[PDB]
Amino acid sequence: NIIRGWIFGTTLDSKTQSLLIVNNATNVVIKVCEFQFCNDPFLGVYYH
Amino acid sequence: NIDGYFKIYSKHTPINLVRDLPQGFSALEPLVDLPIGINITRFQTLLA
Amino acid sequence: SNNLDSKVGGNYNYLYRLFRKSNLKPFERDISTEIYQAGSTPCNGVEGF
Ligand SMILES: *[C@@H]1O[C@H](CO)[C@@H](O[C@@H]2O[C@H](CO)[C@@H](O)[C@H](O)[C@H]2NC(C)=O)[C@H](O)[C@H]1NC(C)=O
């Protein structure tokens, strides 16, 4: 379960709206906001 | 993403492939239609 | 809605888009607040000719 979602949008940097679809461990979240995305986005896991 | 109606179709197939997109045929069933109303020209996946 | 949306000094809370580079698509929503240009010059910051 390594791929978990997507960012969609014309400008992912709060100049415009964008769509987040992200399947986290507990419950998938879908959101449409003027998101200010990170230059290198990911989700992290403690292993063992 | 048509007229803001961001439409998702999907399928899940059990495989045993090692290093390629599995050769074969399957049709995706529509699951949900989001009324998002935004400009989607770009996208980026989220990984763990 | 003149009983709901009009004020004796002017209800200036109701905005509309006055400029855009081209027409938008059916059921699309333009919310962009970037400065538009009516001339061949580029324009930057908050205001200009
Ligand atoms: C969605 O976003 C893209 C990217 O910003 C828009 O492409 C722009 O189109 C205008 C049209 O006048 C050009 O002036 C810009 O230079 C374009 N930008 C880029 C980076 O290519 C596109 O028009 C938007 N679509 C809608 C329907 O709003």
Ligand SMILES: *[C@@H]1O[C@H](CO)[C@@H](O[C@@H]2O[C@H](CO)[C@@H](O)[C@H](O)[C@H]2NC(C)=O)[C@H](O)[C@H]1NC(C)=O
């Ligand atoms: C995945 O994201 C969702 C949405 O942010 C998280 O749901 C939150 O869970 C906490 C703890 O139960 C609640 O207090 C919040 O109200 C929830 N937020 C929403 C908007 O539902 C969820 O916890 C996240 N899962 C993981 C594994 O972090």
